[PDB]
């Protein structure tokens, strides 16, 4: 009945409800591997701690739950920092467990010791802390979990010294707490809710914009009730998109980028209800290009700093986005009637169709496969049964154009960090989450980005994870090459070409199914075949580089 | 119409509703002084930045509003770090504005430059940031204010480089935003509130315990309604104490320390509703000595990490404490009649009286004025018209014993930092806030502690702030001297005696009224006279050192 | 005559003498790419910022010069953190140039912004700083270089906001400073030098142990003179090893690990002169197993905190190691003849031979190629014309056993960070530095470790860098699997097997020459052929997992 600190870690994780970890082995953290082995808790071990970190993010994002990453001292930790930073800006709930030097061997210039891992993580975590006593493990693990899961969600680092984990203590001398933290988020004051609803009622052209916090709490039933009662069209940033999948067509505004053309059509929203969507990269900053300067804005966010960050707002509410959605659905259920918004919804629909049609008209695959056409081939397969993860740059910009009319089970794109290459790990973790949900994961990445984590084909094969990796291959770091041509000059391309390498050949050498395609017909065939089998796959798609996606042209 | 960065700062503060600043002049921040002069906004300039920072804290705490501290580059900032740390652990909303080296003169080994002020403040602030452009000033000032005022309240550092402040910009090119942040805090989900009230109704011996977040939002009307509807007795840590002042005697449990004697009297609460009271120093940590292990605990806090930090809880709600109190009042205004709690309330009263009488029985001023007797002299004058600020150590431990019986308008004691000396600046700021409240501030401090900021008698006189400073003088750093005697040995006193100096003489040399007293009669007379006139005063009170306050043992 | 901040960066690097950068493109740093293009300064662009950072390290280490890494905002920077940490612990002079968010767009929740990159680098750099004005670029780049190159060498982070780099200023409005920093480091006070030499003279069994700072300054001629005058045997940690390559065999003690068997031989050194070798992982910590507790220790290091960190010393000197070697050479060029130390040098030689022979006697390739035998195949090709880079774990522990008797041009192994995977980028950078020297780079890595940076086969092919990557393949994360079996139990292997994948196939799919081998004969043939051509290669070597290397046995 003596147990290790690592055993305490795992017992606390199990009690919290954790069922998977992502990681890479080291002696420093072996006690956690041994405890997981004993308790039949899978640790999905990758070929790089970065991929493990991103997998924990992908698992969290796809499954709307806590992701758990597990890395060893020193380079284990430093290899996980891009995931930490990505989860930080994305508001993704990930518990990063890292080993560190033994406290008893402090300042001995020893193996993997001497990196101030807590200091390195401090700027990019909700909380980061080094455990000082084995007996503290359960309470501090649970504290870390509460930090990560609470609004706004985000990453936490718990640093566990080798001696602290190896230490044995009497199991009856320490209690393993429950996770006692309400599942229901805090909601607005009724006066604020009444004011928001009065504004929503009076608007001529109201819209809702969902952000990541909407996705984390995933109150889709309540969202549907609210949206059905009010008839208000709903848009979302990338992270919020999959929250629109259960909504009636007339109310699906799609990606918030679609608001761009509304002003020119004399149709700019006069009221915007932002639910966890920040003023920033995905919402046009303070430009007024998507969220009009002439609109009254009601913003709901758990972080007061965000409220009107870049633009004057009418009503700033600090509350949980999920809780607020519940409250709005509760309020509008008591309502006899809401203004008819058929005409406005139709306008929203028509404007989306006009964008899509315009792109379709301009796109030609006469000489090489057009990125828009390649994106459409994927779109035909996207529904509730699929999670789409997007990496690259031009690649996701083109892909985004087909994403609003489909209803993905999940959609995981770059956030503010825009870190090329994070998608592979992200998609691998998403696929683990998706297994329980009966979903198939498709990664859509660029030829540049896939190189970051290309070893993970080995992991797919060892773990029999049926991730489909589609590489949009334009023989370049594409968006950066576009930048050079457009911002500097046509003869100023340097350091951005990638005219080498058979990626499907690399996949095949790792035991995954490899395909190379270069047309709508060949791509359609390959994708259909890949989807028909429960096997990991790489589809290398030769695509044109020259086309400029609308988001880039903007 | 060209205006300075400093003018932008002050326009934004005014628009936010700021009416006072505390600080100490430097050239680096002169543009802010000049703008305040133009706009008739007082800056209360102290003799030490630490006193200024603590004054901003006291103003925030006594006034339930934002405090603003203003300090210059380098030593101005480093002199403010004890206030920042105190505000951090006390959850006190203070905006610290600091000057810093000019960006254009970066890395020139120049005057007051080269201190990474934001890095130093990062571990002890909700947000710390250095402004990069004059045009960003209004949006970042307002962002900082939203960070400080949001639940849980806390300090923010906004660092304003000299060139950023001196730069002039067209006033028409930058908008000064409003403070658009709901005054109403987020509330619990009704399911959680229902469960909490169901538990409260079934309990045989329920208690409520208030913490600092309750004092920050000051929802007194709602608290009264809730308490009258349920008949449940209410306790508080030091920071929540003044929130009990408007309650009927039967439901005033007073300081949470009074729960100590309940288990031995077979009267331990079976339910504890913690409203912003954390598990920690003031609540008995996880010992169960105040919050029984056998009790079911409902905990409400804006920080999920705090929920069941040191002890298992039954229900953990993340919400604003003020919003929650409003929600509870609203719910209990509409539900059935609540069970009578007269007998339990009388038990609470009797146990408090038994404690007070026991101390009274033991306390003798035969040979020297006893600290309990001195405390009673003060208590005679405490009501809504008074703010009591407490510093020293033995001094506040004795004072705490008389505080539950009285109903102070404000009570500001040490929090977790326990930093001797913070009281003087705190009380000076409190007196400023108390002007518009029609309150008189009394600082009760130790002879050791008063030395930290003794030059502030000058500030009281220059600004005509009628603070009464009562020095409980036991010619020692008292609690520390007791530590040496009790934990080490009677012959082991070293570095703790202070058998020198006429504090009243020091005050008089700064132009404040000085008194030296040594008995109940002489002390009563001096305090009565000091209270009769709106003049700053120092009352140097000779008190016994040997008596051990109940809390010291515990 | 208006030029960008990025042009100022590049003009300053050029004036300092930088001839290569390693990096990965981003728009945030394009102005630096464009300026390098104009000036014909190569940027070796990799498939991961980590590989670019490790390449800059390898270039610095192999080249004994400044390495420069160039990365974009946000994820560009965060992907470079492992290189920064590695350089930090290894005392390697690398200037990490990173983009960051524009100052004018501060706090706008925009692309790649919002990471406090300086705060993240602070605990693992000599200096980290974000540039506040375009006019400050030349003086702060040069200041950064002076920080990296000064003793003890280490990594510096210079963070260059996008607007600061794109901003254009009059090229004549700012001076580009020269690099004015003495090449000759500070030396000991003569009293301290005299005391050290008096102890060295009186000692019965003196040894010298070199550390990384000896490699950075590479005072080979002075070292040769000093060692010839005194006849004292010289050992080194991994990073100091190539500094022994120009010494006579008699005075080459080799890797400091060899000191382990000396006490049982009644031959423990009575004096140890530590020249930038710290007390720590490579020197036996404070255990006295290599540096005896009974020895008088003279320690010379540019960081006073290192001096007797873990063990009492007799004389603690803060000075540059190169400057100290020059001082020692100067002193011993004008003093009395030194005691003959032939018998002691012979004992050193005998004990090394006993270790090697013992390993050889125990090693069998009957059923699978033994790691010691695979290591011997490599050693046959190691001389001044070769840089050996070592990664993996059991892989380098075995490799270490053959490295003392050969004289490598370069030897770059794991330092204190022990970060599996850093070797590929390191070797790629080393191969760039080795070009001008006519040296060939060989990476000896594990099947586990190679996976970290395997996309760099692409870079080798795109840049025609003839790096030979040797994968010691035991189908596992080997040392960690041994840990599980030895420290936990034979039935407790979890998360450590890697029984999948054709690494030579991966290399081939990137266009590199691939070989798969499983015997002394096959491996010898593949290596000979790969060395005969100036082509990148991958040699996948099937080796046994079960053998325990002496360094693990000791542990
Ligand atoms: C970690 C990281 N490194 C560099 C960049 C700079 N960058 C932006 S887009 C881009 C090109 C991505 O190329 P690819 O993955 O092939 O997608 P494509 O644009 O060609 O579709 C690069 C290198 C970045 N955003 N993140
Ligand atoms: C800034 C700071 N310095 C030192 C201490 C240690 N300390 C705790 S109690 C105490 C004695 C305070 O003496 P006094 O203010 O005269 O109050 P007394 O206990 O005598 O009533 C000291 C020095 C502290 N808590 N904070
Ligand atoms: C970045 C990093 N991750 C994990 C570890 C833990 N670790 C130590 S040795 C080892 C095995 C290395 O395997 P391989 O590269 O194949 O070399 P081998 O020991 O099998 O020769 C691992 C994973 C580490 N030291 N660094």
PDB file of C-alpha atoms in Angstrom, chain A residues 136-347:
ATOM      1  CA  UNK A 136       0.697  17.516  -2.879  1.00  0.00           C
ATOM      2  CA  UNK A 137       0.262  15.630  -6.138  1.00  0.00           C
ATOM      3  CA  UNK A 138      -3.453  14.841  -6.106  1.00  0.00           C
ATOM      4  CA  UNK A 139      -4.613  18.286  -4.941  1.00  0.00           C
ATOM      5  CA  UNK A 140      -2.303  20.068  -7.363  1.00  0.00           C
ATOM      6  CA  UNK A 141      -3.267  17.847 -10.325  1.00  0.00           C
ATOM      7  CA  UNK A 142      -6.943  18.550  -9.581  1.00  0.00           C
ATOM      8  CA  UNK A 143      -6.192  22.296  -9.138  1.00  0.00           C
ATOM      9  CA  UNK A 144      -4.414  22.304 -12.511  1.00  0.00           C
ATOM     10  CA  UNK A 145      -7.394  20.583 -14.147  1.00  0.00           C
ATOM     11  CA  UNK A 146      -9.803  23.166 -12.703  1.00  0.00           C
ATOM     12  CA  UNK A 147      -7.544  25.954 -14.044  1.00  0.00           C
ATOM     13  CA  UNK A 148      -7.493  24.430 -17.531  1.00  0.00           C
ATOM     14  CA  UNK A 149     -11.212  23.650 -17.782  1.00  0.00           C
ATOM     15  CA  UNK A 150     -12.542  26.955 -16.461  1.00  0.00           C
ATOM     16  CA  UNK A 151     -13.499  29.926 -18.667  1.00  0.00           C
ATOM     17  CA  UNK A 152     -11.607  30.967 -20.785  1.00  0.00           C
ATOM     18  CA  UNK A 153     -10.098  27.507 -21.261  1.00  0.00           C
ATOM     19  CA  UNK A 154      -6.352  27.232 -21.682  1.00  0.00           C
ATOM     20  CA  UNK A 155      -3.168  25.267 -21.016  1.00  0.00           C
ATOM     21  CA  UNK A 156      -1.576  24.550 -17.666  1.00  0.00           C
ATOM     22  CA  UNK A 157       1.900  23.200 -16.896  1.00  0.00           C
ATOM     23  CA  UNK A 158       2.456  20.959 -13.901  1.00  0.00           C
ATOM     24  CA  UNK A 159       6.125  20.225 -13.419  1.00  0.00           C
ATOM     25  CA  UNK A 160       6.818  17.025 -11.494  1.00  0.00           C
ATOM     26  CA  UNK A 161      10.421  16.512 -10.255  1.00  0.00           C
ATOM     27  CA  UNK A 162      11.880  13.021 -10.725  1.00  0.00           C
ATOM     28  CA  UNK A 163      12.341  12.415  -6.986  1.00  0.00           C
ATOM     29  CA  UNK A 164       8.807  13.706  -6.301  1.00  0.00           C
ATOM     30  CA  UNK A 165       7.445  11.096  -8.735  1.00  0.00           C
ATOM     31  CA  UNK A 166       9.672   8.220  -7.587  1.00  0.00           C
ATOM     32  CA  UNK A 167       8.962   8.897  -3.882  1.00  0.00           C
ATOM     33  CA  UNK A 168       6.715   6.322  -2.266  1.00  0.00           C
ATOM     34  CA  UNK A 169       4.087   7.172   0.282  1.00  0.00           C
ATOM     35  CA  UNK A 170       1.355   5.370   2.183  1.00  0.00           C
ATOM     36  CA  UNK A 171      -1.718   5.409  -0.068  1.00  0.00           C
ATOM     37  CA  UNK A 172      -4.000   5.959   2.948  1.00  0.00           C
ATOM     38  CA  UNK A 173      -2.098   9.124   3.964  1.00  0.00           C
ATOM     39  CA  UNK A 174      -3.343  11.215   1.027  1.00  0.00           C
ATOM     40  CA  UNK A 175      -6.822  11.732  -0.339  1.00  0.00           C
ATOM     41  CA  UNK A 176      -7.512  11.734  -4.092  1.00  0.00           C
ATOM     42  CA  UNK A 177     -10.099  14.539  -4.505  1.00  0.00           C
ATOM     43  CA  UNK A 178     -13.035  14.429  -6.882  1.00  0.00           C
ATOM     44  CA  UNK A 179     -13.303  16.940  -9.684  1.00  0.00           C
ATOM     45  CA  UNK A 180     -15.895  19.144  -8.012  1.00  0.00           C
ATOM     46  CA  UNK A 181     -16.436  22.018 -10.422  1.00  0.00           C
ATOM     47  CA  UNK A 182     -19.834  22.855 -11.884  1.00  0.00           C
ATOM     48  CA  UNK A 183     -20.391  21.822 -15.496  1.00  0.00           C
ATOM     49  CA  UNK A 184     -22.662  24.838 -15.927  1.00  0.00           C
ATOM     50  CA  UNK A 185     -20.920  28.113 -16.640  1.00  0.00           C
ATOM     51  CA  UNK A 186     -21.874  31.371 -14.958  1.00  0.00           C
ATOM     52  CA  UNK A 187     -24.537  33.375 -16.775  1.00  0.00           C
ATOM     53  CA  UNK A 188     -25.289  37.068 -17.336  1.00  0.00           C
ATOM     54  CA  UNK A 189     -27.213  39.170 -14.817  1.00  0.00           C
ATOM     55  CA  UNK A 190     -30.892  39.113 -15.949  1.00  0.00           C
ATOM     56  CA  UNK A 191     -30.797  42.888 -16.569  1.00  0.00           C
ATOM     57  CA  UNK A 192     -27.927  42.422 -19.037  1.00  0.00           C
ATOM     58  CA  UNK A 193     -29.696  39.484 -20.715  1.00  0.00           C
ATOM     59  CA  UNK A 194     -32.925  41.497 -21.028  1.00  0.00           C
ATOM     60  CA  UNK A 195     -31.009  44.409 -22.544  1.00  0.00           C
ATOM     61  CA  UNK A 196     -29.221  42.148 -25.058  1.00  0.00           C
ATOM     62  CA  UNK A 197     -32.517  40.492 -26.034  1.00  0.00           C
ATOM     63  CA  UNK A 198     -34.283  43.858 -26.429  1.00  0.00           C
ATOM     64  CA  UNK A 199     -31.501  44.991 -28.780  1.00  0.00           C
ATOM     65  CA  UNK A 200     -31.694  41.673 -30.666  1.00  0.00           C
ATOM     66  CA  UNK A 201     -35.458  42.058 -31.057  1.00  0.00           C
ATOM     67  CA  UNK A 202     -35.224  45.681 -32.352  1.00  0.00           C
ATOM     68  CA  UNK A 203     -32.398  45.123 -34.897  1.00  0.00           C
ATOM     69  CA  UNK A 204     -33.144  45.042 -38.623  1.00  0.00           C
ATOM     70  CA  UNK A 205     -30.131  42.900 -39.563  1.00  0.00           C
ATOM     71  CA  UNK A 206     -28.849  41.102 -36.430  1.00  0.00           C
ATOM     72  CA  UNK A 207     -26.113  38.460 -36.539  1.00  0.00           C
ATOM     73  CA  UNK A 208     -24.483  36.171 -33.944  1.00  0.00           C
ATOM     74  CA  UNK A 209     -20.754  35.356 -34.086  1.00  0.00           C
ATOM     75  CA  UNK A 210     -19.446  32.320 -32.200  1.00  0.00           C
ATOM     76  CA  UNK A 211     -15.873  31.812 -31.053  1.00  0.00           C
ATOM     77  CA  UNK A 212     -13.880  29.056 -29.373  1.00  0.00           C
ATOM     78  CA  UNK A 213     -15.566  29.217 -25.946  1.00  0.00           C
ATOM     79  CA  UNK A 214     -18.832  28.294 -27.690  1.00  0.00           C
ATOM     80  CA  UNK A 215     -17.135  25.146 -28.937  1.00  0.00           C
ATOM     81  CA  UNK A 216     -15.553  24.225 -25.576  1.00  0.00           C
ATOM     82  CA  UNK A 217     -18.873  24.097 -23.703  1.00  0.00           C
ATOM     83  CA  UNK A 218     -20.720  22.810 -26.780  1.00  0.00           C
ATOM     84  CA  UNK A 219     -24.260  23.821 -25.798  1.00  0.00           C
ATOM     85  CA  UNK A 220     -25.666  22.886 -29.265  1.00  0.00           C
ATOM     86  CA  UNK A 221     -29.135  21.910 -28.054  1.00  0.00           C
ATOM     87  CA  UNK A 222     -29.536  25.272 -26.331  1.00  0.00           C
ATOM     88  CA  UNK A 223     -28.035  27.137 -29.324  1.00  0.00           C
ATOM     89  CA  UNK A 224     -30.506  25.414 -31.661  1.00  0.00           C
ATOM     90  CA  UNK A 225     -33.463  26.389 -29.422  1.00  0.00           C
ATOM     91  CA  UNK A 226     -32.287  30.027 -29.246  1.00  0.00           C
ATOM     92  CA  UNK A 227     -31.614  30.256 -32.980  1.00  0.00           C
ATOM     93  CA  UNK A 228     -34.917  28.576 -33.869  1.00  0.00           C
ATOM     94  CA  UNK A 229     -36.837  30.999 -31.605  1.00  0.00           C
ATOM     95  CA  UNK A 230     -35.195  34.188 -32.868  1.00  0.00           C
ATOM     96  CA  UNK A 231     -34.380  33.324 -36.508  1.00  0.00           C
ATOM     97  CA  UNK A 232     -31.087  35.236 -36.213  1.00  0.00           C
ATOM     98  CA  UNK A 233     -28.294  34.050 -38.616  1.00  0.00           C
ATOM     99  CA  UNK A 234     -25.184  32.635 -36.907  1.00  0.00           C
ATOM    100  CA  UNK A 235     -21.558  33.044 -38.095  1.00  0.00           C
ATOM    101  CA  UNK A 236     -18.365  31.711 -36.500  1.00  0.00           C
ATOM    102  CA  UNK A 237     -14.615  31.949 -36.611  1.00  0.00           C
ATOM    103  CA  UNK A 238     -12.839  28.698 -37.586  1.00  0.00           C
ATOM    104  CA  UNK A 239     -12.986  27.293 -34.049  1.00  0.00           C
ATOM    105  CA  UNK A 240     -16.698  28.062 -33.724  1.00  0.00           C
ATOM    106  CA  UNK A 241     -17.697  26.698 -37.168  1.00  0.00           C
ATOM    107  CA  UNK A 242     -18.704  23.167 -36.107  1.00  0.00           C
ATOM    108  CA  UNK A 243     -21.194  24.668 -33.627  1.00  0.00           C
ATOM    109  CA  UNK A 244     -23.250  25.689 -36.691  1.00  0.00           C
ATOM    110  CA  UNK A 245     -23.597  22.127 -37.987  1.00  0.00           C
ATOM    111  CA  UNK A 246     -26.919  21.343 -36.233  1.00  0.00           C
ATOM    112  CA  UNK A 247     -28.616  24.654 -37.112  1.00  0.00           C
ATOM    113  CA  UNK A 248     -31.350  25.149 -39.747  1.00  0.00           C
ATOM    114  CA  UNK A 249     -29.886  26.200 -43.138  1.00  0.00           C
ATOM    115  CA  UNK A 250     -31.592  29.585 -43.109  1.00  0.00           C
ATOM    116  CA  UNK A 251     -29.715  30.481 -39.924  1.00  0.00           C
ATOM    117  CA  UNK A 252     -26.280  29.213 -41.009  1.00  0.00           C
ATOM    118  CA  UNK A 253     -24.211  32.256 -41.902  1.00  0.00           C
ATOM    119  CA  UNK A 254     -21.033  30.183 -41.953  1.00  0.00           C
ATOM    120  CA  UNK A 255     -17.539  31.531 -41.462  1.00  0.00           C
ATOM    121  CA  UNK A 256     -17.432  35.134 -40.253  1.00  0.00           C
ATOM    122  CA  UNK A 257     -15.177  36.036 -43.176  1.00  0.00           C
ATOM    123  CA  UNK A 258     -18.384  35.987 -45.302  1.00  0.00           C
ATOM    124  CA  UNK A 259     -19.488  39.250 -43.678  1.00  0.00           C
ATOM    125  CA  UNK A 260     -16.837  41.083 -45.771  1.00  0.00           C
ATOM    126  CA  UNK A 261     -19.088  41.783 -48.765  1.00  0.00           C
ATOM    127  CA  UNK A 262     -22.170  42.929 -46.787  1.00  0.00           C
ATOM    128  CA  UNK A 263     -21.344  46.672 -46.660  1.00  0.00           C
ATOM    129  CA  UNK A 264     -20.990  46.904 -50.455  1.00  0.00           C
ATOM    130  CA  UNK A 265     -24.376  45.132 -50.762  1.00  0.00           C
ATOM    131  CA  UNK A 266     -25.910  47.785 -48.467  1.00  0.00           C
ATOM    132  CA  UNK A 267     -26.567  45.031 -45.944  1.00  0.00           C
ATOM    133  CA  UNK A 268     -24.060  45.485 -43.092  1.00  0.00           C
ATOM    134  CA  UNK A 269     -25.389  44.060 -39.815  1.00  0.00           C
ATOM    135  CA  UNK A 270     -26.773  46.697 -37.432  1.00  0.00           C
ATOM    136  CA  UNK A 271     -26.412  44.393 -34.391  1.00  0.00           C
ATOM    137  CA  UNK A 272     -23.690  41.840 -33.637  1.00  0.00           C
ATOM    138  CA  UNK A 273     -23.870  39.431 -30.717  1.00  0.00           C
ATOM    139  CA  UNK A 274     -20.326  38.142 -30.203  1.00  0.00           C
ATOM    140  CA  UNK A 275     -20.236  34.988 -28.070  1.00  0.00           C
ATOM    141  CA  UNK A 276     -16.584  34.287 -27.241  1.00  0.00           C
ATOM    142  CA  UNK A 277     -15.408  35.665 -30.572  1.00  0.00           C
ATOM    143  CA  UNK A 278     -12.614  38.115 -29.773  1.00  0.00           C
ATOM    144  CA  UNK A 279     -11.743  41.257 -31.703  1.00  0.00           C
ATOM    145  CA  UNK A 280      -8.642  40.016 -33.510  1.00  0.00           C
ATOM    146  CA  UNK A 281      -7.312  38.068 -36.458  1.00  0.00           C
ATOM    147  CA  UNK A 282     -10.455  36.120 -37.340  1.00  0.00           C
ATOM    148  CA  UNK A 283     -12.925  38.983 -36.845  1.00  0.00           C
ATOM    149  CA  UNK A 284     -11.174  41.726 -38.868  1.00  0.00           C
ATOM    150  CA  UNK A 285      -9.437  43.309 -35.840  1.00  0.00           C
ATOM    151  CA  UNK A 286     -10.863  46.852 -35.319  1.00  0.00           C
ATOM    152  CA  UNK A 287     -11.224  47.457 -39.063  1.00  0.00           C
ATOM    153  CA  UNK A 288     -15.022  47.269 -39.113  1.00  0.00           C
ATOM    154  CA  UNK A 289     -14.772  45.127 -42.281  1.00  0.00           C
ATOM    155  CA  UNK A 290     -16.713  42.203 -40.759  1.00  0.00           C
ATOM    156  CA  UNK A 291     -18.119  43.655 -37.528  1.00  0.00           C
ATOM    157  CA  UNK A 292     -19.378  47.050 -38.718  1.00  0.00           C
ATOM    158  CA  UNK A 293     -18.432  50.270 -36.888  1.00  0.00           C
ATOM    159  CA  UNK A 294     -22.074  51.305 -37.431  1.00  0.00           C
ATOM    160  CA  UNK A 295     -23.380  48.166 -35.691  1.00  0.00           C
ATOM    161  CA  UNK A 296     -24.279  48.001 -32.011  1.00  0.00           C
ATOM    162  CA  UNK A 297     -22.139  45.229 -30.528  1.00  0.00           C
ATOM    163  CA  UNK A 298     -23.097  43.035 -27.590  1.00  0.00           C
ATOM    164  CA  UNK A 299     -20.025  41.060 -26.539  1.00  0.00           C
ATOM    165  CA  UNK A 300     -19.939  38.156 -24.104  1.00  0.00           C
ATOM    166  CA  UNK A 301     -16.551  36.805 -22.984  1.00  0.00           C
ATOM    167  CA  UNK A 302     -15.138  35.341 -19.750  1.00  0.00           C
ATOM    168  CA  UNK A 303     -12.159  37.731 -19.952  1.00  0.00           C
ATOM    169  CA  UNK A 304     -13.141  41.367 -19.335  1.00  0.00           C
ATOM    170  CA  UNK A 305      -9.986  42.572 -21.109  1.00  0.00           C
ATOM    171  CA  UNK A 306     -11.452  41.361 -24.373  1.00  0.00           C
ATOM    172  CA  UNK A 307     -14.665  43.389 -24.100  1.00  0.00           C
ATOM    173  CA  UNK A 308     -14.430  46.080 -26.770  1.00  0.00           C
ATOM    174  CA  UNK A 309     -10.655  45.479 -27.085  1.00  0.00           C
ATOM    175  CA  UNK A 310     -10.403  47.050 -30.577  1.00  0.00           C
ATOM    176  CA  UNK A 311     -13.826  48.596 -31.112  1.00  0.00           C
ATOM    177  CA  UNK A 312     -16.510  50.474 -29.162  1.00  0.00           C
ATOM    178  CA  UNK A 313     -19.264  48.147 -27.889  1.00  0.00           C
ATOM    179  CA  UNK A 314     -22.823  48.732 -26.627  1.00  0.00           C
ATOM    180  CA  UNK A 315     -22.984  46.052 -23.917  1.00  0.00           C
ATOM    181  CA  UNK A 316     -20.018  44.226 -22.350  1.00  0.00           C
ATOM    182  CA  UNK A 317     -20.935  41.079 -20.441  1.00  0.00           C
ATOM    183  CA  UNK A 318     -18.475  38.961 -18.476  1.00  0.00           C
ATOM    184  CA  UNK A 319     -19.889  35.454 -18.322  1.00  0.00           C
ATOM    185  CA  UNK A 320     -19.361  31.925 -19.600  1.00  0.00           C
ATOM    186  CA  UNK A 321     -20.337  31.559 -23.252  1.00  0.00           C
ATOM    187  CA  UNK A 322     -22.064  28.196 -22.675  1.00  0.00           C
ATOM    188  CA  UNK A 323     -23.944  29.515 -19.635  1.00  0.00           C
ATOM    189  CA  UNK A 324     -25.002  32.547 -21.673  1.00  0.00           C
ATOM    190  CA  UNK A 325     -26.272  30.398 -24.550  1.00  0.00           C
ATOM    191  CA  UNK A 326     -28.323  28.403 -21.987  1.00  0.00           C
ATOM    192  CA  UNK A 327     -29.704  31.606 -20.491  1.00  0.00           C
ATOM    193  CA  UNK A 328     -30.604  33.000 -23.935  1.00  0.00           C
ATOM    194  CA  UNK A 329     -32.377  29.754 -24.873  1.00  0.00           C
ATOM    195  CA  UNK A 330     -34.241  29.786 -21.516  1.00  0.00           C
ATOM    196  CA  UNK A 331     -35.355  33.414 -22.012  1.00  0.00           C
ATOM    197  CA  UNK A 332     -36.537  32.985 -25.620  1.00  0.00           C
ATOM    198  CA  UNK A 333     -38.464  29.825 -24.736  1.00  0.00           C
ATOM    199  CA  UNK A 334     -40.727  32.000 -22.544  1.00  0.00           C
ATOM    200  CA  UNK A 335     -41.323  34.298 -25.547  1.00  0.00           C
ATOM    201  CA  UNK A 336     -44.559  34.178 -27.557  1.00  0.00           C
ATOM    202  CA  UNK A 337     -42.976  35.511 -30.731  1.00  0.00           C
ATOM    203  CA  UNK A 338     -39.851  36.918 -32.318  1.00  0.00           C
ATOM    204  CA  UNK A 339     -39.559  39.172 -35.421  1.00  0.00           C
ATOM    205  CA  UNK A 340     -39.671  37.272 -38.708  1.00  0.00           C
ATOM    206  CA  UNK A 341     -36.209  37.298 -40.285  1.00  0.00           C
ATOM    207  CA  UNK A 342     -36.783  35.237 -43.446  1.00  0.00           C
ATOM    208  CA  UNK A 343     -35.775  38.083 -45.786  1.00  0.00           C
ATOM    209  CA  UNK A 344     -32.571  38.834 -43.843  1.00  0.00           C
ATOM    210  CA  UNK A 345     -31.625  35.147 -43.634  1.00  0.00           C
ATOM    211  CA  UNK A 346     -32.182  34.846 -47.410  1.00  0.00           C
ATOM    212  CA  UNK A 347     -29.897  37.840 -47.964  1.00  0.00           C
TER     213      UNK A 347
END
